[PDB]
Amino acid sequence: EARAAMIKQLEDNKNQKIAEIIKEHTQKYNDIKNYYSEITATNLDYRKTLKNE
Amino acid sequence: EERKNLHINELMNNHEKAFAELKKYYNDITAENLNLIKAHKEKIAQIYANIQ
Amino acid sequence: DPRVINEQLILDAVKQFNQENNKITTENIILQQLRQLQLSFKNILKIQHLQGLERLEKLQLDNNIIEKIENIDHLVNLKWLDLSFNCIKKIEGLDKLKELTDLSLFNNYIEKIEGLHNNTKLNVFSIGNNRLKSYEEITLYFGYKPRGEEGTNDRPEFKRLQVLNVSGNPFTKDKENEYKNHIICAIEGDRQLIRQDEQISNSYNFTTTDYYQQMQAQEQKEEMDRQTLKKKKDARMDILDNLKDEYLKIEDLQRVKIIKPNQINEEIEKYCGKINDHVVEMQAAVIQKHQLILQEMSKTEVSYKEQEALHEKETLQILKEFEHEKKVEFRNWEKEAANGDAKKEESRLKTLLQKTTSLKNKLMDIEIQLVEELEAIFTDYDTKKKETAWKDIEEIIVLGQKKIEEENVKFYSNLNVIKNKEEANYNSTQQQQLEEENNEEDDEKASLLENKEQLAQMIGNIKETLIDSHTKIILSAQMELQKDLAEYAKQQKNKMYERNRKNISQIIAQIDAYQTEINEKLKQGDDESDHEN
Amino acid sequence: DDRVIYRSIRFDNKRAPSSQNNDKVFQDNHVGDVQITKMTQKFEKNPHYPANEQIQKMVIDLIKDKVIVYYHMNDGEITPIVKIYPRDSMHGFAKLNEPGGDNKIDDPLVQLENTKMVNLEKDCLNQLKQQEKIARDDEKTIREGEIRLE
């Protein structure tokens, strides 16, 4: 019983940390994507000057 | 403990690979415009001077 | 900057650990009160600032860039250590981290089980997804070595190592279950399931059951050896262990050997044999008499325990009668407060206060009687042991010295006999041979044979040094045992005084408690008649 | 194992089975519904734990709204551990409506000991009830089984 409880709580901690890692990766991915989407959108829209020029 | 650390590190390696992929992808698609536009404006000035 | 432990970083880590565990962050969480450390995913590279954290028993520093094991070896408390899945590449610092129980260096760059020969306490080992090439490193810790290798490890190292994982290593990915089978047969039901393997089982002959019996027999023999050595040291007799070696320290005997190395060497061998023998008998006799000392100390301590427990129960029951006496006292006092006879309430409570004074006197006298009992216990034990056991040790150590010096004497006599034979032979040869290749050994022999007094002085100084060193060692052993027995007597006296002081102070405390309870009841009775106006 | 080698419960037959205090109303095989007044669990002095830290004895006087816990004595001790704890709060009944009252309940230990004594009370009462049923069933079987011979 003690071993099962200890393994259960060990897994609880390990998988909670794994979930934290996954959530961190997902949110950082979203942030990088958004910032460089801003950059790329500016870059692309900054050519209608050329085309009207 | 061993097995959970194995999975944790596999997961972080996957995350790092995905992040690096996205990094090169968006840098590559970010790296184009300003200089071409500078050249366009340079030749704009050249042209209009030729007309004057 | 790679994360290196500092005071502020430690403070932050403690903050976070307490936040996670719901632990009250006692503001003065001692910088040196650390047993469990966990610094994973900080990407630490080196270990530092662990002074005061030597009490660290469960260390967690895996999943980072660390590559070296350092500044944790002085943290010998580390039993459950994980430094795995990192840039680490070697096993070290655990030699003094022998207490290591659950060692993990998984997913690292280690290629050998090194430093764990001093981690033989490690029952649990993980070296997986490292860069190893063979499992035999772990089995070497079990008295198992590959055929054709000369090694001094005939005794298992990881005798208790039953947790063994190497999964994910280069060789562990190589032709699976080979290392499992061989390690298990040389070392968790997988262990027996793998012993079920037929052919790799044939690859070993020292079975796991044989390993069990070897471990059991070795434990028993080592217990016997420890007990015997403790017996001899309690006799304070092992100091004579160098008794026959005094000729080694005596240089003159080496020169004497020149006259007759063969006869003199054999005589010195016999001298060492006799010296060691007499040493053995005399030291062993002292062993037995100090064993008597130990048993009589045990009986005297048991007498201490029994007298103290008797007085324990005496005072306990006495205070129990006082307890129920005051129980009835206070029940009646309460029912009277329901009535209002504050005057007689106060009278009986002051009577109980005088009862408390009398009980203080009686229980102090009871503890005095217990102290007297135990002090007479000490006196009688000292009389019997010192006069019987200590004396007997005196006479038998003196007898050991006597036979030791006697053996010195007859060894000296035989050396002199060899000298006389050599001198006679040389003198006979001198009158019939005046030239033989000027040998150097014979030159020194003839030098002594001319300076008879030189060789005589050499052998006399041999005897002098032998007797002097033997007497010095024997007297040192006797003084050491005297100090041991006086030390035990002082220990018992200090124990008696400590129990006396604790009982005195706590009797003071309980007397104050009873007196304060009675004062509280008296004040209740007084102020119950104070509100009746 | 738990070291409570003795367990007692005082009753007040004077006290009818007051519906207000069910924990004081006990499953008595003999009297039926009567109001308990006292419980007690005597915890063996474990050599593995200190005498003064192990509860030597626990005394759940339901009426006193408190318990008296004694912690085992040590060698040379003549000062007994007579600690008295108000039961009014040990069951978490400490009402936070009181503004300004120091909330050591915030620090875990207050409610920790509160719930320790809550568990002691529940264990004592339920063990008493369960042993009452044990005796009831054993005697029922004994007095319901006919006389027979080997």
UniProtKB/TrEMBL annotation, chain A:
It comes from the Eukaryota. This is Growth-arrest-specific microtubule-binding protein. It comes from Tetrahymena thermophila (strain SB210). The chain holds residues 211 to 263 of 472 of the full protein.
From TrEMBL, chain B:
It is found in: Cell projection, Cilium, Flagellum; Cytoplasm, Cytoskeleton. It comes from the Eukaryota. Belongs to the DRC4 family. This is Growth-arrest-specific microtubule-binding protein.
Automatic annotation (TrEMBL), chain C:
Keywords: Cell projection, Cilium, Coiled coil, Cytoplasm, Cytoskeleton, Flagellum, Leucine-rich repeat, Repeat. PANTHER family: DYNEIN REGULATORY COMPLEX SUBUNIT 3, PROTEIN PHOSPHATASE 1 REGULATORY SUBUNIT SDS22-RELATED. Pfam families: LRR_4. Residues 335-362, 419-458 form a coiled coil. Belongs to the DRC3 family. It comes from Tetrahymena thermophila (strain SB210). It is found in: Cytoplasm, Cytoskeleton, Flagellum axoneme. PROSITE patterns: LRR (PS51450). GO terms for cellular component: cilium. InterPro entries: Cilia_flagella_integrity, Leu-rich_rpt, Leu-rich_rpt_4, LRR_dom_sf. Transmembrane segments: none annotated. This is Dynein regulatory complex subunit 3.
Automatic annotation (TrEMBL), chain D:
It is found in: Cytoplasm, Cytoskeleton, Flagellum axoneme. Belongs to the DRC7 family. This is Dynein regulatory complex subunit 7. It comes from Tetrahymena thermophila (strain SB210). The lineage of its organism: Eukaryota, Sar, Alveolata, Ciliophora, Intramacronucleata. The chain holds residues 553 to 702 of 852 of the full protein.
